[PDB]
Amino acid sequence: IRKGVIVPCKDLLDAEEALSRALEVLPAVVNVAVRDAEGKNDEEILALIKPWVQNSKADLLARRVRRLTFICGRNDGSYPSYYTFRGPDYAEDDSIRHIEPSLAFQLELGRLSKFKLTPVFTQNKNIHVYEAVGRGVETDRRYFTRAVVRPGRLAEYLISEADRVVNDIFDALEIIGTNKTDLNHMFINFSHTFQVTADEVAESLQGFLDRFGPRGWRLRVHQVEIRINCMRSENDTMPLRVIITNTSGFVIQIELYEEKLSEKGEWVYYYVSGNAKIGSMHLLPVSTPYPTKNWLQPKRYKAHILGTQYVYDFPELFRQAIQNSWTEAVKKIPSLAAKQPAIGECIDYNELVLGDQDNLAEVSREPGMNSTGMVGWLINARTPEYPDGRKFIVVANDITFKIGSFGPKEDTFFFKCTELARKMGIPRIYLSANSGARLGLAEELMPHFNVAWNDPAKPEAGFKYLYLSDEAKRRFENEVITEEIVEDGEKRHKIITIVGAEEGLGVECLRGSGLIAGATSRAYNDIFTCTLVTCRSVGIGAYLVRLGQRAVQVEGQPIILTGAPALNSLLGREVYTSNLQLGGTQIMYRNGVSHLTAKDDFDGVTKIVQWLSFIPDQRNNPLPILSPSPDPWDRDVVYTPPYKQTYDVRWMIAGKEDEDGFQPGLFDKDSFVETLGGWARTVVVGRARLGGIPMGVIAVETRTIENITPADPANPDSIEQVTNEAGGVWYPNSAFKTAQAINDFNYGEQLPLMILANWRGFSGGQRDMYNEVLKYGSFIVDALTRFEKPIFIYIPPHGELRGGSWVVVDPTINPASMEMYADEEARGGVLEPEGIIPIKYKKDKQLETMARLDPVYRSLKKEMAKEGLSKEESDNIKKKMQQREELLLPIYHQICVQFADLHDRAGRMKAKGVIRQSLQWRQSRRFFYWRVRRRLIEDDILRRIEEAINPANTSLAASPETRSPHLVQLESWVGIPGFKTNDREVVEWYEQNQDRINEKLEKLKKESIADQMRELXXXXXXXXXXXX
């Protein structure tokens, strides 16, 4: 136990004899008092106590006594002076002076850890001022004041006491001077258990701070901390710590906290303040080290040498991406820019940190100070699409915090974030910069474990096992699983399994990794999911990129699974030279793991805030539609594709740039955003807007694209393979791209789909067949049946939809949400007109029609039929016809081709009812604007009808005009004659009679509630339920 020593000497010289002889009662802490209040000795009293300690440097050391105090009682009421020597050599800590060690704890100081401290002279022994300069950067220079109060009087005592103590601090800061100080702080600790409560003390707080405030502003004082107690709650204390900061020339910052244990073993800052909970510092330890200026700079640099922004710099990257989002929209849409919220107030974020019962809590604290290798925020961004506000979650790893590795704490956090984004419906964005899961060994068992050899003299003769000494075995026991086996007559505890105290070494990390891997897989299908490769995303991190589906890769950041050197070691030779040689953009964007490639960390954010513009703010919320604004809805589609040559299909979607002017596409000018344009370029996937209505687009590339698969370095006998993916055909990769895109616009994104169908089938070739073309063909069908929002399959001019292709895109796949249209000059059959001709219109069938239309051939036929001509005569008719038919054959072939093409024509399609309407490409925009809008408002009204009615397809005939059995009831409530058609008239009706539908829904809701009540021996049960 720490033995207490107290000795009251009479003199300074005679005090030495009560040291060397008083230490003899020690087989700890020692105090020495004096009776010479003659002079207020300083420095010379320090040169009068140092000779007694440097001489007995081994005397105090041997007894193992830690602290040595020197109290000096003054006869005028003066607070006695105390001097303490601590440690091995007892160097005398200048920090604890003129105050008892018990008071040290009360003085704090463990909060000025990130500072070089040098104290200064104080006229009042109670107050202590310190010069503080940031350990790293010298630009920071501050004066911290530390005062502790304890009474001498046997109600409004404390408020009058406060005036005396703060005036004393102000008068001392005056003599030391304001000098050159960036910030100044003062702490006033109260030892008192006063019976009163902070609510009245806050009213009185306001009173004296406005008087002292002006003076405090001059000294350059930024904040003051008062630490009082309130015994009336039980009559158990409520320690109320209060911080008052002078931010903006006027205080207006009174943060009223409460000292409570977080359950985790730390005392935290739980505030019940009056600055409207949107302030600083909440559920933070009392041990926070008052950070310096530029304290973020070392961490910033560490992230920047890895080529990534420091994690806490990302919220401001998002503010500027939104800032840019308005500056560009005010250009395109002038006037309607009045809702711009300035440079600040763009976004309104709040940190997320694991709560008391591990339930995420919204905190607004200092950047940095992250307890775990992961951080999150709930951001309310005022986008021009949702100018009132829109929320989303942003999760990211701290690449400085243990190279950003995934430990169990990091996992539980990431999870509880995904869990929240789901619970709110708001999208989730992950900023990846990690090092997979955490590795680790038990460090404590490294300098303690023993080895049992076969031969102790020559250890190279193999070792039997590894054991632990009995004294070192009792030290752990729960950190190691040991078996006892006596060898050489020793109690040897052989290590049979190592556990280790510390977490995050092995399997505990894999378990958590698996949890979040599944959580991300689940989330993708519910809320909008997105990832960003801001830096190397390895192992589990690499998978959350794929489970997160929608990924953006910064050019020089790899999505690696197994380390580039780890692979070289496995092969035994230096095959791979870079982590990007197998993880980089040239792999992931070129195989479709990456949807977009961004030049830098900000370019990434920018591109993300771009997808979020297309996506509804919540889960089941209406799309971010705007006024027609740049490209009006009432404009005709100018670019029309040629029938001769090939065309960049992109020109049909947004528009073609030309020498003379610009011919627009069917979507809004430059609203198209192509994704996965590095993988299976035979299909163009992207998002675009149609008169303000955002929607998903899939189109077919007509030009013969060539993907060149790279050479494998692992096999020196591997060369790059030149493969030409001929345009307008479906290949394993193209099919996969299509299918993926569909599910991506389906889950979370919730977008209507536009499919400019132009494929002439599937790749039936041996190589493509073996490459599972059939597997990925199915994936399109599977994906289409899962969809909910409207899908429009529109065959464009020149566009084809032959056999294999048509089957996997037909509206009877999902009749409830699909709608098929075909262009007036489009074609669609079972086979190409060049392909049917050698099956239904063979050589013999063409000659029967030749001996019908051609006059020469049927006249020569009349010669053979009449007979009466010899062997040399019949040869003439044969050599006359088999010359005529030889020259007619090429044009007669083309006749059947045109004949067969008249079957494949659009008209036939409407006649057999496989399409709704024939469409003129010129006015496609004008038609789809009102058909997309009509379907979107109607789909929801029907969804609402069903939700009111039931609180819980069948034929080739199924056409969208009957997609729901309620479209008959809604038809009669509306009253429009041309209901199935006149899309514009319908939309405008709903908009006007918004109140009449909600009138009819409530009528139906009360009617459906009456059915459920009635559906609920049975009579006896009901009687009993009535009695209850």
Residue numbers in the entry: 1186 to 1212, 1253 to 1379, 1386 to 1464, 1469 to 2187, 2196 to 2259, 2300 to 2311
Text of the article:
Biotin-dependent acetyl-CoA carboxylases (ACCs) are essential enzymes that catalyse the ATP-dependent carboxylation of acetyl-CoA to malonyl-CoA. Eukaryotic ACCs, instead, are multienzymes, which integrate all functional components into a single polypeptide chain of ∼2,300 amino acids2. In addition to the canonical ACC components, eukaryotic ACCs contain two non-catalytic regions, the large central domain (CD) and the BC–CT interaction domain (BT). Here we provide the structure of Saccharomyces cerevisiae (Sce) ACC CD, intermediate- and low-resolution structures of human (Hsa) ACC CD and larger fragments of fungal ACC from Chaetomium thermophilum (Cth).
Using molecular replacement based on fungal ACC CD and CT models, we obtained structures of a variant comprising CthCT and CDC1/CDC2 in two crystal forms at resolutions of 3.6 and 4.5 Å (CthCD-CTCter1/2), respectively, as well as of a CthCT linked to the entire CD at 7.2 Å resolution (CthCD-CT). In all these crystal structures, the CT domains build a canonical head-to-tail dimer29, with active sites formed by contributions from both protomers. The connection of CD and CT is provided by a 10-residue peptide stretch, which links the N terminus of CT to the irregular β-hairpin/β-strand extension of CDC2. The connecting region is remarkably similar in isolated CD and CthCD-CTCter structures, indicating inherent conformational stability. CD/CT contacts are only formed in direct vicinity of the covalent linkage and involve the β-hairpin extension of CDC2 as well as the loop between strands β2/β3 of the CT N-lobe, which contains a conserved RxxGxN motif. On the basis of an interface area of ∼600 Å2 and its edge-to-edge connection characteristics, the interface between CT and CD might be classified as conformationally variable. Indeed, the comparison of the positioning of eight instances of the C-terminal part of CD relative to CT in crystal structures determined here, reveals flexible interdomain linking. The CDC2/CT interface acts as a true hinge with observed rotation up to 16°, which results in a translocation of the distal end of CDC2 by 8 Å.
